Amino acid sequence: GAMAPSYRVKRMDIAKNDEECVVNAANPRGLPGDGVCKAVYKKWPESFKNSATPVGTAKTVMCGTYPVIHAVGPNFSNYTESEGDRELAAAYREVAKEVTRLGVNSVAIPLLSTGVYSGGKDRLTQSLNHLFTAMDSTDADVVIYCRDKEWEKKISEAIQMRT
Ligand SMILES: [Cl-]
Ligand SMILES: [Cl-]
Ligand SMILES: [Cl-]
């Protein structure tokens, strides 16, 4: 475990993370995809061997000894708000199980279902609150990765609010 488990936020490419493992915002089919998923495919292509997994699940594949946790959030274009919210919560619960099983002291994580799976909505708060519900009982240092300057400020605010 980390000595004093923390949350932090950085605005940069998650493929350049300084943590012991990474969470991919994956598609259910294990395809290279777009956005975070394409960056992850370029950096750790070996981790996409048999990485397909259903919505609301996470599947870990090792790239050498470096764990890539493929977490599949719902596409809100297809899910109802209600069913999408349940699947997004579930995906983060499966990430917490994998992070615990691996024994890592730190993890890099993006905000699931906030990009091309957002159904054209702002889901910063919804996605971040499900991340906290899952990861609060783990003792890994969590580093959240984002690309937008205003999102960085809001995520930082939300972390600081809990102290
Ligand atoms: Cl960058
Ligand atoms: Cl997304
Ligand atoms: Cl972002």
How many angstroms separate the CA atoms of 65 and 103, rounded? 13
Give residue 142 CA to ligand 2 midpoint distance, Å.
19
Whole-Å CA distances, 3 to 41, 81, 88, 138, 154: 32, 38, 29, 12, 26
CB atoms near residue 92 (< 10 Å) = 25
Give residue 145 CA to ligand 1 midpoint distance, Å.
10
Closest ligand to C-alpha of residue 146 is 3
- What are the residue ranges spanned by the domains of the chain? 1-163
Q: What was the experiment behind these coordinates? A: X-ray
13 is in an annotated binding site: yes
Q: Is 18 left (phi over 0), alpha (psi -120 to 50) or beta?
A: alpha
Give residue 124 CA to ligand 3 midpoint distance, Å.
8
73 is in an annotated binding site: no
Give residue 54 CA to ligand 3 midpoint distance, Å.
24
Give residue 125 CA to ligand 3 midpoint distance, Å.
12
41 is in an annotated binding site: no
CB atoms near residue 163 (< 10 Å) = 4
How many angstroms separate the CA atoms of 154 and 159, rounded? 9
35 is in an annotated binding site: yes
34 is in an annotated binding site: no
115 is in an annotated binding site: yes
Q: How far out from the chain centre does Cα 86 lie?
A: 16
Closest ligand to C-alpha of residue 12 is 1
Closest ligand to C-alpha of residue 39 is 1
What backbone torsions phi and psi does residue 158 show, to the nearest 5 degrees? -65, -40
How many angstroms separate the CA atoms of 152 and 103, rounded? 28
CA trace torsion 36, 38, 44, 45 (10° rounding): 150
**H/E segment holding residue 6:** none
